[model samples]
Target: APAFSVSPASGLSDGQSVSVSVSGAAAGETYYIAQCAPVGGQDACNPATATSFTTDASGAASFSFVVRKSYTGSTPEGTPVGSVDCATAACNLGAGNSGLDLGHVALTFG
Candidate 1:
């Protein structure tokens, strides 16, 4: 049961950073974590700033990403992978193991 969460879920300035902690995942599992935004942001996922990790015996890893509304690029719903601005639109910080779904949390915004 892999889990993911975003800290400071709201009241964030644009282009601010957020922490995405992954816990309870399988030990030694590989993953890719990124920030995602809704349709209005012109992109769905942020890949450039994404981080990769392999869980230790504890099955936990932590990552930080910058959320930008001006990010240009394109994930889960056929949108290209990249960054997004969470200020005026909804955003998410999520992860996955290859194609399998892991977990996600709402990104901070102000």
Candidate 2:
């Protein structure tokens, strides 16, 4: 199982860039990183952002990106409450594939 983490773990504001770290993945493998939002709903922005990073010899990779102030989804729960996911492939909005749920860290935005 892969592990993930975000620095300054809580109380984030919009446009703040957070450090994302992942481990336990295949070393030297490239993984896609996306800012998924709206928490438990189907509203991931830039699912195809083409943002990716490669793991190092220690089976880890780190990068940073800005979080949005708010997110939209088909449901009323469309708010900026979600997690950042690092996956082998782009995560599908809402119903995600368990196989690709490699690593994720919950985050909230103001």
Candidate 3:
């Protein structure tokens, strides 16, 4: 199992940068991370702002993402994925590493 976390726990806004961290992932595994909502499936997640990381030996990685209303990116399945405004949607952070780190962390925006 794995865990995900974000910085500035409150006072979030559009265009603001947020810090992201993942821990307890399988060592050396590559993970596709994204911000998304439960609706619209993968199409609702932002790929442009997403990231891919090969975790360190400690099974941890970190990155930063900018909050935005619209974004696009490639999915793990090589399909098109998009994003929605977090203000009007349920924002969740996803860390996809096959079946090992299939986890999501809920987010909040002002």
Candidate 4:
């Protein structure tokens, strides 16, 4: 399996939607997405605490999430973690799998 990465790696902002264009992907293969909380400010080394969203018709997928304003910290549901080839579930493209580390944004106070 090949390793992948995302652009704008500094991290995305809360409530913002970003586009994920997958390269080196297997043509004609279906993919799904997932999301989880960041660990130690890194995605690749962290584990998935939640599953956000999945992909649509396009190999390009999108996910939107908002960071909580309070230190209490509320988790976002349904934000995409990464994509997996429909043909193989084990071939995941996020943490705890064979994909990459391209998801994580900080929330701002309102």
Model 2, TM vs. native: 0.57
**Candidate 1, residues 83-103: lDDT per residue as tens digits?**
445556776666787656787
**lDDT of candidate 3 over 47-100, digit per residue (tens):** 467667777757777777666544453445655544455555567677776657
Give the higher-lDDT candidate: 1 or 2: 1
C-alpha lDDT of all candidate models, in order: 0.67, 0.51, 0.65, 0.31
Query: Model 4, 7-90: lDDT tens per residue?
Result: 433333433343434443333444434442342222221133233333334433444322211112122343433422111111
Candidate 1 residue 35 Cα shift, in angstroms, is 1.6
Off by over 4 Å in 4: 1-4, 38-110
For model 2, residues 15-96, the per-residue Cα lDDT tens digits are 5667766776655466667654433444445443337766666767666665544533233344543444322223221111
Off by over 4 Å in 3: 38-43, 69-83
- In candidate 2, clashing pairs total 0
Q: Indicate which candidate wins on lDDT.
A: 1
The pairs that clash in candidate 4 are 34-80, 34-81, 34-82, 35-80, 35-81, 52-78, 52-79, 93-99
TM-score of predicted model 4? 0.32
Candidates' RMSD to native: 3.8, 8.3, 3.9, 11.9
Ranking by lDDT: 1, 3, 2, 4
* Residue 75 local lDDT, model 1: 47
* Cα deviation of 85, candidate 3, in Å: 2.1
